[PDB]
A = this chain, B = another copy of it.
Amino acid sequence: MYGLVNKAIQDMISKHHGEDTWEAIKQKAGLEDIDFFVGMEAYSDDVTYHLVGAASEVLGKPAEELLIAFGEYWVTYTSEEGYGELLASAGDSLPEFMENLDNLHARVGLSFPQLRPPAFECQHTSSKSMELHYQSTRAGLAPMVLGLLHGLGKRFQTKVEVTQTAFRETGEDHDIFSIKYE
């Protein structure tokens, strides 16, 4: 993924547990080479999965727990490290924001030309709920989606309950989530 994603993971861990723990985690991941991540440069996905795996071992937490945290962090981190206006342009409510999400990533992708963004389709089951279809070229990041949805809830002061109802992981064509809000 682009290095911004890894820089975020680093930031989150550095801020929550310290530079020593980040160093250990980098080292365990077999990335001591890399002095720093370049935000606008493409890295092999490997780098991200390894960091997450290594972060799991060192912190003694499951990978999935970290991806949930990281999902929520990213909402804050993007608003502060140069994507605040772009974020705000995507709307001022959760369902609006999610409807716009492919369009946000399209805009991101003019600037990051090699982006393989996820794809998100909403079916609104009412004014307070929806089905969210998450399609990705990558495996394993549904728990990140969950955290991202909870970060979006914080951003719009909406309470969101999210439950995953289909799993790419088992062989289903793609992750699907039921979501209830305010």
Contacts and interface: CB of A to CB of B under 8 A. Distances in A.
Interface stretch (A56-64, A91-99, A104-112): A56-64
A146 B164 CA distance: 9
Given A147-B161, A150-B163, A159-B159, A125 B180 contact: no
Interface size class of A (residues with CB under 8 A): 20 to 34
How many identical chains are in the complex? 2
A60 B163 contact: no
Interface in A129-182: 129, 131, 142-143, 146-147, 150, 153, 159, 161-167, 169-170, 178, 180
Nearest to A178: B64
Interface of A: 60-62, 64-65, 68-69, 72, 125-126, 129, 131, 142-143, 146-147, 150, 153, 159, 161-167, 169-170, 178, 180
16 contacts: A60-B125, A61-B125, A62-B125, A62-B165, A64-B165, A65-B129, A68-B163, A68-B178, A72-B161, A147-B161, A153-B159, A161-B162, A162-B163, A164-B164, A167-B167, A169-B170
